[PDB]
A paper describes a structure:
The receptor tyrosine kinase [name] is activated by hepatocyte growth factor binding, followed by phosphorylation of the intracellular kinase domain (KD) mainly within the activation loop (A-loop) on Y1234 and Y1235. Dysregulation of [name] can lead to both tumor growth and metastatic progression of cancer cells. Tepotinib is a highly selective, potent type Ib [name] inhibitor and approved for treatment of non–small cell lung cancer harboring METex14 skipping alterations.
In contrast to the WT and Y1230C proteins, which contained mixtures of the 0P and 1P forms, the recombinant [name] and L1195V protein samples indicated the 2P form as major species present after purification and prior to additional autophosphorylation. The A-loop was nearly completely defined, except for H1238 and D1239, comprising a similar conformation as in the WT structure also regarding Y1234 and Y1235 positions, which are both unphosphorylated. Based on our tepotinib-bound [name] crystal structure, we conclude that the [name] mutation does not directly affect the A-loop conformation and is not involved in tepotinib interactions. Structural modification within this hydrophobic cluster by [name] mutation might explain the shifted αC-helix position and disordered JM-helix observed in the [name]•tepotinib crystal structure. The [name] mutation might also indirectly destabilize the A-loop conformation via F1134 in connection with the DFG-motif residue F1223 causing an enforced A-loop autophosphorylation.
Numbering used by the authors: 1067 to 1098, 1104 to 1114, 1120 to 1148, 1152 to 1237, 1240 to 1346
């Protein structure tokens, strides 16, 4: 109810398309004198909102928050994230963040997920492409509730129906399609790997279908050259086949902050 912001407050710059999605494109906005991201929803809507309304209660420095929505293809207002998504940023030929900085972003994602895990929310699509950065280089775990979409179709394979992020998905999800907090831990492992390779595509010489047999043979992603061993030991623990022996997010926050603390820059 309070989520519903009035139409005269929100401006939407349709020519400046900042993101692109399946359900709708993400246009630039200016709510009045603050900057915004306005996500459309062109192409179910009744069902999508009731799950989304719970988003407003959530607040945490490393989780994306809801500013509001405007009814009229209803528009979803979201805080403007200056430095874009995290997959685009670490690849960006401009900012050269250190190994420490990359481990810092990963630690920040651990805290966003620790929060959401404490609320019993399963993300289901945790990846560098679905995490944003603000002016202060704070990582915000996004793509959940009303912000939920596909923002880069290449990493989603098309019998089931709904398109799945196979290369980020854990072994039980690939076989069953049942997602959990311990499955989200697998995805986090893959995301950490992205940070240490600076946004390299996981499993470059592998088809979208073939990851289940690949993983079952006893294979994992290799250790990146500048990935410090302890972090590789963490990455491997996240891909433990028993979704039980995998580490909790509170343990991930604890262990990674220890690793982060051992660097200069
Ligand atoms: C060159 N260009 C200059 C402008 C820069 C800043 O532009 C922005 C782009 N997007 C936002 C934004 C903010 C809040 C919420 C969302 C919605 N949302 N989007 C994505 C998303 C956005 C873009 C690319 C990809 C991928 N792959 C994924 C993921 C999760 C999610 O929840 C978007 N803000 C600013 C980017 C670089
Ligand atoms: Cl930090």
């Amino acid at each position: 109810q309070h989520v519903v912001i009035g139409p005269s407050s929100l401006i939407v710059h349709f020519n400046e398309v900042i993101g692109r999605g399946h359900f709708g494109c993400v246009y630039h906005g200016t709510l009045l004198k603050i900057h915004c991201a306005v996500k459309s929803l062109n192409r179910e809507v009744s069902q999508f909102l009731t799950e989304g309304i719970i988003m407003k209660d959530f607040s945490h420095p490393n989780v994306l928050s809801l500013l509001g929505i405007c009814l009229r293809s209803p528009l979803v207002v979201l805080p403007y994230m200056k430095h874009g998504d995290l997959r685009n940023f670490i690849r960006n030929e401009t900012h050269n963040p250190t190994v420490k900085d990359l481990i810092g972003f990963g630690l920040q994602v651990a805290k966003g997920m620790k929060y959401l895990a404490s609320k019993k929310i399963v993300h289901r699509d945790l990846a560098a492409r679905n995490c944003m950065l603000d002016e202060k280089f704070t990582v915000k775990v996004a793509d959940f509730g009303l912000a939920r979409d596909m923002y880069d179709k290449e990493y989603y394979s098309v019998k089931t129906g709904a398109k799945l992020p196979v290369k980020w998905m854990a072994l039980e999800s690939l076989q069953t399609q049942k997602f959990t907090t311990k499955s989200d831990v697998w995805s986090f492992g893959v995301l950490l790997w992205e940070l240490m390779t600076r946004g390299a595509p996981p499993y470059p010489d592998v088809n979208t279908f073939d990851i289940t047999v690949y993983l079952l043979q006893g294979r994992r992603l290799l250790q990146p050259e500048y990935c410090p061993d302890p972090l590789y030991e963490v990455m491997l623990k996240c891909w433990h086949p028993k979704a039980e022996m995998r580490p909790s997010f509170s343990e991930l926050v604890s262990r990674i902050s220890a690793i982060f603390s051992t660097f200069i820059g």
